[PDB]
Design a protein around this ligand. Structure first.
Ligand SMILES: CC(C)CN(C[C@@H](O)[C@H](Cc1ccccc1)NC(=O)O[C@H]1CCOC1)S(=O)(=O)c1ccc(N)cc1
Lengths: 99, 99
């Protein structure tokens, strides 16, 4: 669909059997989700942004259904204020910026 | 223009007579630019990002040219790692998301 930016671009996602709302974020290289129950082994990674850095757990090959569209990719889980869908998943659903 | 997201969506901006590159960020509510020379009075303010909170200086009614698009709005200048154009300015140059 087409989304204007008058309000935060929130979308409904489904990961690991749970329904969550996430922010379509073009300035996020990676997808980072709030702490949640996810199965599998992970790797302790670390990312930075405004305000500093955070310790995050990296899970690969995670299936996420974003607005009905499915995608499989890396998902970071950790201390995030908002669930963020970054470019690693935004490219898989064919999301573009237009002006 | 149409911007695909395989690479960070960076654009050339002209502010305060200076040329800079900035990231188009749909996940950012406001525009945050690295610390730079800007004339005028400003108000102190703090921003919350992924790693914590930074204290920035707020400038109102500042002219900024993103591409050939001129826009006037609020700009926060402070310790951000990347210059980011947020939704306060993205809506003025008519930027949308599509998938
Ligand atoms: C370009 C960078 C440095 C900024 N990031 C993207 C931004 O969209 C980020 C998204 C977000 C919104 C609200 C709360 C917390 C995070 N907004 C952000 O800082 O909002 C401030 C600036 C003005 O208004 C509020 S990031 O979150 O650090 C990030 C970095 C790496 C990955 N892999 C994932 C996320």
């Amino acid at each position: 669909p087409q989304i204007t930016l008058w309000q935060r671009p929130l979308v409904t996602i489904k990961i690991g059997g749970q329904l969550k709302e996430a922010l379509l974020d073009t300035g996020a290289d990676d997808t980072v989700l709030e702490e949640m129950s996810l199965p599998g082994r992970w790797k302790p990674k670390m990312i930075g942004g405004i305000g500093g850095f955070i310790k995050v757990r990296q899970y690969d090959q995670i299936l996420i259904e974003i607005c009905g569209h499915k995608a499989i990719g890396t998902v970071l889980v950790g201390p995030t204020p908002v669930n963020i869908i970054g470019r690693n998943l935004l490219t898989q659903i064919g999301c573009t910026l237009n002006f």
